[PDB]
């Protein structure tokens, strides 16, 4: 409940932000849509630009966002734009910026696991300079993927199924329901992003402050889920791609205590899945063992494929 | 002018007796993993 | 013409099988003979050093085409084969495995001969040999291609040979570098491209005729053309035939759209305005003119946008490097023109943009190009996106004609009214 209470604090706190700019969105005037247009535009694109080419140009995106959020003018397509145009713009750009980071993790990272780090660092860095934006991230990240909280949504009695699938985070429309395959990835990419943000820190600026969402939340995550009964395909998948991304940073931090947690899932939580998963979904559970059978004997969890190297930073 | 500190590890304070005994075992007990991170003392 | 190059680029960028859900047809010469089918490498009972190499390079179990091809080739007596399956199904890995099994370790002379249309393609096939047969000490390979100048009187000691068609002929006959009567296996890789040169077809046959009769004849082709099938029969006598229908790709799971724009600067404004509207990871943009592409990519870069540019002047290996970076995420958008325009398999692509419509020469819709271009995104149920830029009524005329062929509505997109754009693909 400590988590569920904290889970609601962020959710209804975001709803407060949905309403603080209420009127900027619900405006149909010509100028009223031009403003709403140019802000969301020049606030959600730099995040889409985040590449793996070089940390040298990755600073441009960071600075362009810091200027935008801090109020300075920012060069957009055509004429420059700033938040100073509207008082509601700030509390609006912070909302749309937050969704983009999870969205970039939703689509890009799900497909391309390595892009999780060059996006996280910018997020983990903007989180420091502007803590308000971070709670908004934790807001959107949590609803779109309640498994990141982590809490498994329980079935409320007397309710239709399509109502319940939406709660699980499945994208659903009038008649279309998102397949499981094209759903599982959307959740991988989200927690692979989450597993990257907690271990990375923005190098530039020389800040003595501390990580806003510390690697402590990575321990609780693994703990909080390993103490409850696993879902068939969701757990054994999410449990893997979280450890692949953040299992190297946790091994260094909580040296022996982390290993204990691994020799548990090996002999206490693996049986908890062999029965739960049917023969038609053992795909995820198999990767999870192939991942640990090595790591346990190798005494080492490989650094995640895609980690930003020194070369990436200087270059 | 102050600069705050961290919470990566949890002090020996704020740590229940059931949790202290978990961190001290050579094996964890299924379903009773402490939520709070371990202390600096027992990284072994 | 450009089929050899397309094959070459397809080799350099292919990272794994192209999965297929069509069942393989088998046309065994003696139908009375039961069908040969395998589901794992253990069943074939390969040599230890050979199976060691197979598992070494990442193969868990035979591919769909290999489930029928491998046993048929390893069966006794030696049975010939003509295989037809699209590029990327495992054809090359198949006859490389077959070769290394039939060879004898101690005998220092050519026992297996492969014909590749070109020198570059020969190298790629050679690389698969070196990998799969890395656990075969003393087993070497010799490249019998133009440019491999050799001194008269020399005798080859390699147990395998690979070379272009015109030169391999010289090796065996006039220069006496090879004795054809010791060849136990013969392959003609990529017959689909082999026929593109009239000289190659004749030179390949003449070589095939100098071989013994007990020599296992093998031929492979990506396409099912008639000119191929007519050519394959002349090369492989008393043959078996294996066919695998090309994976048909559809638009069932893609949402198609388009935008009306007055000029290029509006097509560009239309594109930039979209980027803030929806989740867009990486996307491709196909243009009509090389002058326009270089402009667009420049205009894109100018806005602080990481873009990759594919142009025809670039070498083949250079095209691959840009593509590889594109897959690695180094570049987030690829603007191309006539270079690899059918469809490139980059997985993190969320949107396909047709800055100009896929136009065939003569000014008609290029439906094959349009289908493959989007067929790549959204296979086996993935959701993709398609946006067509219309700059005139003639371009608009083509759009409805494409809409006719595929029977899917390409709905209108107004790049204004963000609310609508957010709804486009999520
Ligand atoms: N059994 C297998 N398991 C996994 N990957 C495989 C297997 N067989 C082949 N591959 C890989 O799939 C890709 C295509 O292999 P290849 O043999 O070149 O196919 P394709 O028929 O052969 N191409 P092409 O020669 O142009 O018609 C390569 O990257 C191989 O390493
Ligand atoms: Mg081949």
Numbering used by the authors:
A (entry chain B): 384 to 698
B (entry chain C): 379 to 422
C (entry chain F): 54 to 479
Provide the authors' own sentences about this structure as they appear in the paper.
DDX19 is a member of the DEAD-box helicase family, which are RNA-dependent ATPases composed of two RecA domains (referred to as DDX19NTD and DDX19CTD throughout the text).
The heterotrimeric Gle1CTD•Nup42GBM•DDX19∆N53 complex exhibited similar conformations in the presence of ADP or AMP-PNP•Mg2+, with the auto-inhibitory helix still bound between DDX19NTD and DDX19CTD. The inhibited state does not differ structurally in the presence of ADP or ATP, as the nucleotide-binding pocket readily accommodates the additional phosphate and Mg2+ ion, with minor changes in the sidechain conformations of K64 from the auto-inhibitory helix and E243 in the nucleotide binding pocket. The Gle1CTD−DDX19CTD interface involves 40 Gle1 and 35 DDX19 residues to generate an interaction interface area of almost 1300 Å2. These observed structural differences result in a dramatic reduction of the local electrostatic potential at the human Gle1CTD−DDX19CTD interface compared to the yeast Gle1CTD−DDX19CTD interface. Thus, for S. cerevisiae Dbp5 activation, the extreme negative charge of the IP6 molecule would be necessary to overcome the electrostatic repulsion generated in forming such a positively charged pocket, but for human DDX19 this requirement no longer exists. Gle1 binding facilitates release from auto-inhibition by first inducing conformational rearrangements in DDX19CTD that partially open DDX19 and generate a cleft between DDX19NTD and DDX19CTD (step 1).
